[PDB]
Design a protein around this ligand. Structure first.
Ligand code: CDL
Ligand code: BCL
Ligand code: BPB
Ligand code: BPB
Ligand code: PC1
Ligand code: PC1
Ligand code: SPO
Ligand code: SPO
Ligand code: SPO
Ligand code: SPO
Ligand code: SPO
Ligand code: FE2
Lengths: 65, 281, 305, 260, 54, 44, 65, 46, 46, 44, 54, 44, 54
């Protein structure tokens, strides 16, 4: 790195940003998983919208009461 | 461009945010980060008032009015055409005033002077926020704030005052009015005294502060001094605005009746409440 | 940070008797006591006060005006000290009824005393104006205070003397009393339509708000540059220093234009004078030329209909 | 005369309001004209006159006759500042800061600026000197509040750089103006009172640190102070707020600097 | 049109770019609010009527 | 040869060229948005 | 700083965290302002709740139609 | 588009990044307010 | 409570911080679902 | 080659590249959120 | 008309161009708002009526 | 020959020529817009 | 009429030209607004009536 304008910050704040970064690695991975799951559910919901399920429509398989 | 003496003061530094990103001038105006923000907000607010003029149907500047949402909307949003433009203009005005105060801080600070001026502007900002934000939120609806019109916010003043009868009987109101009148009196006296000292009888020598003290001690018998008069001016103005904000924050919130009914308590005090004669009884 | 709002340590010594040009010191009294309470804010010295011919005239007339109103208040309470204590703000010395018109034939008890007190007040106020002029003249100063006071007197005269004569009735002057004169104000507004739609009323309010604005601005500026000796203004006019420059540059960088140590006081005096000047004009036009200001505003592009 | 019109809706209300608009325009012009007596004509950043002078022309000059035989000041007039300014422009275009070339406080530029006033003390009404130490004044004594004489003086870095010897008071005005603060160099410096926080045990100076107390411009004569040197002292003490910001032990400043 | 570039020997780029950014954002907000104000082109209300949300 | 900002001819041309590239990119995005809106709902 | 376990990351990611940090300084300040404003409004709303405004209640000052 | 990078030989990164963070947060708060204002897309309902 | 710091002589900070970030995000998403499930405190109704 | 800031060509390219990586990450998160909202409830 | 160019020996280009830009934008906004105010030439409403948007 | 702003004759002519080129470009775009509006809906 | 040019030895060109520009623009706006106010010569409404756009 030739920028040499960020290197002037004190070592304590370097540590600070290091661990802010550790936590955003961890839970950015977790967020990617959760929101990819929602996008998958959304794809299936759209496919369900475009199909004529919504006109001829099945009875309940199980009682639930 | 520059005053004869301005250049030795145009130095870097003394700014809260943004280093020297906006640490430059445009003509005489110092810009800064908060100058950029305040120009944005002021421009947007004036534009939205013009768009209100278009929607309402008048181009008469004295008839343009931007009304707040009606009472049924409560503290929620309203359509732009019937109350939302008022909300956006209010946000723009609040942002512009606050950015103006912070820009003043930056300038006071580049020049090495105290922060009395952004202090005193904050009092006016808080009075405006009392009228527009604190009281209507405490009181349930945006419809209790005033419209943005030259002659239609006077209608708001009149209606709000007469909801409680003669508003003259609000006591914090009386204190604020006395402060305002005293402030105008002090301003006239101060300007006159300094001008008369600097511009004496015509062709004779310029006067001294001793002459000012002598004149005013001859007049009434107690001169306050230059530092005293400037302190008294700042404090009179700030007290007036503070008591205005108080008299309006308590109105319709802890007092709901005629204000002479408030004054009624002194009359009913135990050791004269029953005597016949006089105005009362 | 020290804010310069209150002195943090005080000093005192010999009293200052004041300058001595063209002033008859036989009339100047002796210096009074020093007040430690007043010293935390400004000067602590009281006196000496000048007592001249106009001083005695004004003192006599004002004392008799105040005494006349007080004696009427005592009569109006039935001579009961407790009733006087409890109804001090409700008593009123009310002018003659409309049917007397401008005549001085009103009996003592519906407005003869009002006329007597008004005569005393007239003499007191005009004597005080003359005294302001002469106190300025004795020290070789300008007469700016006299003319600002003349603006205030113009509003006072319109309220109590000129407008009643134009309307042909003493019943339309202001009663002497706290709540009574407040009700006079409210009822004047009610009778003539909104005074809010009187354009000169609006101008008067604009200049009162401008007085509060300008004088907060100026007090704050002078207290902010008092670290460079900014409060010593006559000398900054005489010999410009860095306080004057920093104040000018603050206001120039803030709003694009500034003033001088001298010129801000021209702004101040005119801002304060215009209040009562436009107020007197508005009250004089009120009822004499327009008797329903809201309709006038409708006719002049001010009100929606 | 209620309600007759000369033409249209024009009556005495309208005549009065339009007359006032004209009078207000004239008065605004006059007020600005009076306020164009210091600092004009306008100039480029390189000292040459600008193409701008403004919609408002300069007024005719007027003369103040100074008291005590000091002469006459006539304004507007030719204004130079009779001192060199140690600044170098940052950009070629206009409206940009001029950075100090050497030490900023001490060449006297920026918040540390000063003005070449008359190197004479300002006088009271009777001709004597206006500002004066307590010992030189007859009858004056500290009258209320915490007497600062004899207290140590602490700078902005939480060192004590000297301690208070005397108070300079303003005779007619009856108020303290300077702290004579003496160092263990042995020479004395002047401290504006509005820059010092007098506490119970200690006189705090937020503006300066110990190492900058020695640099304060000293006084020519030891019982009097002239206007020039008052600017000089006040400008340095005040410019200490920005130019001694690094050396300062402020919790909030260190807070923000560590974050920044 | 070819030598319009000489405008940059007249104007300092920094100030011009700050002003231009402020102007462009303000203009975009202007136009979006104007569209939102009219019952048509208020895309939010249009979608609300299309899908019967209110 | 006229100079106020102190930039030279080559600097001016370089800065103006990169500006204009940005300007035409902005314009292209605006045209795409305008066509999308026009197709979605015309105003003429 | 004695930790010496964060210093092993490459300079490019040090730059990365430096500017992530710059942006969270800026808009953490902005978030503090916005949410303090909401808390002020909430305080005034609570004071309005506890007072008997909600029983005796003022008419509209301005027409708005 | 390729050489937009030289914007950073014009602007100091620190100041630009502070301004950009402030701008982005303010814009997000703005839009969440426009959505909150309309009866639909006001999610804070119920 | 004073010497809880010695936990870091037991656990490597990197691993702990990754795990803690994952845990906190998952817990927040969980609670959002709990609020979303009840007819009140469900903001996605509108 | 103006260098008001003081940066060179390589420094400029490095800073701009890391900026743009951050910008596209922000944009990707925004697109995911926008698609989620659009699927949940369209505005067109 | 040939020597109008000497106006630039009277006026500084920077100030004139700033003032001209401000003036032109304000005039354009003026005229657009005037057109939007009238029931005709309010192009938005015109297109709303033409396509039966309401 | 006044020299209020400092420019010479050749500088004045060059600046005025580039100004007028910009002015006529602006005018041409305005005329095209005006003709488009007039054809779309006349005001005379 | 021949020596009217000596007015420029009385008045500074810069101030006069600024004042003249302001005056001319204000007068033009005056007259256009006066024309727009009257039901006739309000060219907008007139074109609306002639082409029957209402
Ligand atoms: C040609 C074509 C025709 C055109 C026609 C149209 C003209 C358009 C003009 C546009 C306006 C231009 C600018 C005007 C403001 C100029 C101010 C100025 O120049 O200051 C210089 C000058 C500075 O003095 P200085 O240099 O500091 O003194 C140094 C000396 O060593 C020491 O000197 P000194 O200590 O001896 O001070 C002496 C001097 C200096 O005064 C001061 O020190 C400043 C004080 C400011 C407060 C003054 C206001 C006091 C109000 C008095 C009563 C008010 C009620 C009047 C009734 C209301 C009207 C119906 O005192 C005065 O001048 C004030 C006298 C007030 C008497 C008012 C009598 C009733 C009105 C009669 C009109 C004529 C008035 C006098 C005119 C000649 C003056 C020489 O101050 C003045 O002269 C004050 C000017 C007063 C103007 C008139 C005041 C009232 C105005 C009424 C407005 C009504 C509008 C219409 C509405 C209703 C209509 C139906
Ligand atoms: C319902 C009531 C009406 C109304 C009715 C009136 C009437 C009626 C009048 C005013 C007037 C004024 N009103 Mg209004 N007013 C209303 C609403 C407002 C509002 C508001 C926000 O609602 C405001 C800010 C104002 C403000 C003002 C002032 C601008 C103005 C008075 C100037 C002044 O200082 O007089 C105070 C100063 C004086 C009276 C001068 C006194 C001078 C003399 C010399 C003093 C002598 C002192 C004596 C000797 C005592 C000595 C004491 C000892 C020495 C201790 N009004 C509504 C619409 N108002 C006046 C005016 O000018 O209107 C155009 C006026 O007459
Ligand atoms: C003791 C307290 C007093 C006091 C104090 C001080 N006051 C100050 C200062 C101090 C100390 C300053 O330092 C500051 C300043 O620099 O002055 C030159 C300021 C200022 N005092 C203004 C007006 C003013 N002071 C009033 C009152 C008092 N002030 C009280 C009494 C009143 C009324 C009605 O009473 C008014 C109108 C402006 C001139 C100026 C702000 C400009 C601004 O913020 O620009 C930024 C805003 C704009 C340029 C325009 C914004 C337009 C919005 C978006 C659309 C708004 C429409 C509107 C909501 C409705 C219309 C109906
Ligand atoms: C510009 C417009 C402002 C202004 C102006 C000015 N006002 C001045 C001066 C100027 C310039 C003076 O030079 C003069 C003076 O000397 O000041 C120290 C004066 C005064 N303004 C007084 C009162 C007052 N001003 C008010 C308003 C404004 N004034 C407006 C805002 C109000 C109200 C109701 O608002 C009130 C009550 C007295 C203190 C005093 C006259 C004493 C008198 O006449 O005594 C004569 C009367 C007595 C001696 C009776 C005493 C009764 C017994 C003894 C107790
Ligand atoms: C005494 C009366 C004052 C009270 C106020 C009266 C009301 C009129 C407003 C004037 C306020 C005081 C300023 C007077 C002088 C100002 C000045 O000198 O400008 C020069 C300065 C020029 O700076 P400069 O003066 O330093 O330039 C130096 C060169 N000379 C001196 C030669 C000019 O102008 C400015 O930079 C700032 C502008 C001041 C005016 C701002 C007022 C804003 C009001 C907005 C109202 C819009 C109407 C809205 C209506 C409804 C919608 C359409
Ligand atoms: C109701 C109105 C009451 C009267 C108001 C009088 C002032 C009106 C506003 C004038 C502000 C600017 C004046 C100086 C100036 O423009 O100089 C620029 C330029 C450059 O001037 P300059 O700044 O280089 O100064 C020349 C030298 N001195 C200072 C000595 C005079 O002027 C010109 O070259 C030609 C001027 C053309 C006419 C004015 C242009 C528009 C000015 C109005 C503001 C912007 C347009 C707004 C349109 C929308 C409606 C508001
Ligand atoms: C109410 O009125 C309504 C709203 C109805 C109608 C309103 C009408 C108004 C009049 C509309 C006004 C429109 C204006 C006039 C449009 C102007 C558009 C142009 C001028 C804006 C310019 C855009 C170009 C921008 C995007 C530039 C981008 C370039 C950056 C990406 C980097 C380039 C910056 C420098 C040169 C790069 C680095 C320099 C090097 C060489 C060191
Ligand atoms: C009222 O009008 C409304 C609101 C209705 C419509 C108006 C809308 C307005 C007009 C829209 C305006 C939009 C503006 C123009 C959008 C601008 C967006 C900006 C450009 C987004 C830029 C984002 C830049 C990103 C955040 C840059 C990030 C740089 C990084 C922080 C540097 C290091 C990169 C790291 C941290 C990320 C990847 C590496 C690791 C270690 C994860
Ligand atoms: C209510 O009233 C209504 C609205 C109904 C009617 C209103 C009527 C009013 C009176 C309309 C007023 C119209 C005004 C008078 C029209 C003025 C038009 C002209 C004066 C505007 C000028 C436009 C020219 C601009 C676009 C210049 C563009 C040139 C730039 C692209 C670069 C050129 C700048 C310099 C010279 C280039 C670099 C120089 C180098 C060589 C150093
Ligand atoms: C409501 O009341 C109504 C309206 C019904 C009735 C109103 C009646 C009122 C009273 C009417 C009042 C009318 C006034 C009194 C008329 C005055 C007319 C005269 C005095 C005006 C003068 C006009 C002359 C102007 C046009 C001068 C033009 C000369 C310039 C072209 C250049 C000459 C200037 C200098 C000398 C040239 C250069 C000099 C060199 C040698 C240095
Ligand atoms: C125990 O305490 C004692 C009894 C010893 C004394 C205490 C007295 C207290 C109670 C005094 C109370 C005084 C009241 C409260 C003062 C209130 C004054 C009110 C507020 C004045 C307000 C407005 C009055 C102004 C407008 C009057 C203006 C009238 C002037 C224009 C002069 C009028 C000119 C007259 C009519 C000319 C008549 C000429 C002769 C021939 C009659
Ligand atoms: Fe003053």
């Amino acid at each position: 790195t030739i920028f040499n304008d960020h290197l002037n910050t004190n070592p304590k704040t370097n540590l600070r940003l290091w661990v802010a970064f550790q936590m955003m690695k961890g839970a950015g991975w977790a967020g990617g998983v959760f929101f990819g799951t929602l996008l998958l559910i959304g794809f299936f919901r759209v496919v369900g919208r475009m199909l004529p399920i919504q006109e001829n429509q099945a009875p309940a398989p199980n009682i639930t009461g | 461009a520059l005053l004869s003496f301005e250049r030795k003061y145009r130095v870097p530094g003394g700014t809260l945010v943004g280093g020297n990103l906006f640490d430059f001038w445009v003509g005489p105006f110092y810009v800064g980060f908060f100058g950029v923000a305040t120009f944005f907000f002021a421009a947007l607010g004036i534009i939205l008032i013009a768009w209100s003029a278009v929607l309402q149907g008048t181009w008469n500047p004295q008839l343009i009015s931007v009304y707040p949402p009606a009472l049924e909307y409560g503290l929620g949003g309203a359509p732009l055409a019937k109350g939302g433009l008022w909300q956006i203009i209010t946000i723009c005005a609040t942002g512009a005033f606050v950015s103006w105060a912070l820009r003043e801080v930056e300038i006071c600070r580049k020049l090495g002077i105290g922060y009395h001026i952004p202090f005193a502007f904050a009092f006016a900002i808080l009075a405006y926020l009392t009228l527009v934000l604190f009281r209507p939120v405490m009181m349930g609806a945006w419809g209790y704030a005033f419209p943005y019109g030259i002659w239609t916010h006077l209608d708001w003043v009149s209606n709000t005052g007469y909801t409680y009868g003669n508003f003259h009987y609000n006591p914090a109101h009386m204190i604020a009015i006395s402060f305002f009148f005293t402030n105008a009196l002090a301003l006239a006296l101060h300007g006159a005294l300094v001008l008369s000292a600097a511009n004496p009888e015509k062709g004779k020598e310029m006067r001294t502060p001793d002459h000012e003290d002598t004149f005013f001690r001859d007049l009434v018998g107690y001169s306050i001094g230059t530092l005293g008069i400037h302190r008294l001016g700042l404090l009179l103005s700030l007290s007036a605005v503070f008591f205005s904000a108080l008299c309006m924050i308590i109105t319709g919130t802890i007092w709901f009746d005629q204000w002479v009914d408030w004054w009624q308590w002194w009359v009913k005090l135990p050791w004269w409440a029953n005597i016949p004669g006089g105005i009362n009884g | 940070e020290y804010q310069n709002i209150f002195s943090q340590v005080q000093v005192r010594g010999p009293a200052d008797l004041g300058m001595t040009e063209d002033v008859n010191l036989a009339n100047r009294s002796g210096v009074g006591p020093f007040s430690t309470l007043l010293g935390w804010f400004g000067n602590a010295q009281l006196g000496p006060i000048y007592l001249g011919s106009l001083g005695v005239l004004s003192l006599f007339s004002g004392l008799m005006w105040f005494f006349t109103i007080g004696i009427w208040f005592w009569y109006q309470a039935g001579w009961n000290p407790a009733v006087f204590l409890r109804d001090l703000f409700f008593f009123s010395l009310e002018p003659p009824a409309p049917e007397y018109g401008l005549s001085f034939a009103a009996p003592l008890k519906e407005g003869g005393l009002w006329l007597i007190a008004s005569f005393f007040m007239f003499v007191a106020v005009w004597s005080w104006w003359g005294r302001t002029y002469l106190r300025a003249q004795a020290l070789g100063m300008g007469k700016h205070t006299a003319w600002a006071f003349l603006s205030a007197i113009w509003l006072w005269m319109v309220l109590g003397f000129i407008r009643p004569i134009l309307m042909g009735s003493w019943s339309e002057a202001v009663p002497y009393g706290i709540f009574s004169h407040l009700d006079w104000t409210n009822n004047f507004s009610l009778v003539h339509g909104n005074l809010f739609y009187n354009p000169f009323h609006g101008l008067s309010i604009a200049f009162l708000y401008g007085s509060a604005l300008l004088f907060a601005m100026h007090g704050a500026t002078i207290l902010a540059v008092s670290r460079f000796g900014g409060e010593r203004e006559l000398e900054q006019i005489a010999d410009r220093g860095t306080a004057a420059e920093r104040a000018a540059l603050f206001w120039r960088w803030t709003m694009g234009f500034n003033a001088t140590m001298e010129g801000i006081h021209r702004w101040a005096i005119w801002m304060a004078v215009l209040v009562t000047l436009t107020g007197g004009i508005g009250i004089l036009l009120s009822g004499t030329v327009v008797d329903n200001w809201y309709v006038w505003g409708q006719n002049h592009g001010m009100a929606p209909l | 005369m209620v309600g007759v019109t000369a033409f249209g809706n024009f009556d005495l209300a309208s005549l009065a309001i339009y007359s006032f608009w004209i009078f207000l325009a004239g008065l605004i012009y006059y007020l600005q004209t009076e306020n164009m007596r210091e600092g004009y004509p306008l100039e480029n950043e390189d000292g040459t006159p600008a193409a701008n002078q403004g919609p408002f022309p300069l007024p005719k000059p007027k003369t103040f006759i100074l008291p005590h035989g000091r002469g006459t000041l006539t304004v507007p007039g030719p204004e130079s500042e009779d001192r060199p300014i140690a600044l170098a422009r940052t950009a070629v275009s206009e409206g940009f800061p001029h950075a100090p070339t050497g030490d900023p406080m001490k060449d006297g530029v920026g918040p540390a600026s000063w003005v070449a006033r008359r190197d004479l003390p300002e006088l009271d009404g009777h001709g004597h000197n206006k500002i004066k130490p307590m010992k030189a004044a007859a009858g004056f004594h500290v009258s209320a509040g915490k007497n600062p004489i004899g207290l140590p003086v602490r700078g902005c870095d939480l060192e004590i750089a000297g301690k208070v010897v005397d108070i300079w008071v303003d005779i007619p005005e009856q108020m303290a103006r300077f702290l004579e603060v003496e160092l263990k160099d042995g020479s004395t410096r002047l401290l504006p009172m509005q820059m010092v926080k007098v506490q119970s045990n200690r006189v705090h100076v937020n503006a300066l640190s110990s190492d900058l107390f020695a640099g304060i411009p000293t006084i020519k004569s030891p019982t009097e102070v002239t206007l020039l040197e008052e600017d000089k002292i006040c400008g340095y003490v005040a410019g200490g707020l920005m130019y001694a910001a690094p050396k300062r032990k402020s919790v909030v400043a260190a807070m923000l600097a560590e974050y920044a | 049109m070819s030598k319009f570039y000489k405008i940059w020997m007249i104007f300092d780029p920094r100030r011009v770019f700050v002003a231009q950014g402020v102007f462009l954002f303000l203009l975009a907000v202007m136009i979006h609010l104007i569209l939102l104000s009219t019952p048509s082109y208020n895309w939010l209300e249009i979608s609300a009527a299309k899908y019967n949300r209110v | 040869d006229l100079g106020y900002t102190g930039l030279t001819d080559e600097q001016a041309q370089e800065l103006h060229s990169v500006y204009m590239s940005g300007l035409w990119l902005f314009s292209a995005v605006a045209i795409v948005a305008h066509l999308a809106v026009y197709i979605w709902r015309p105003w003429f």
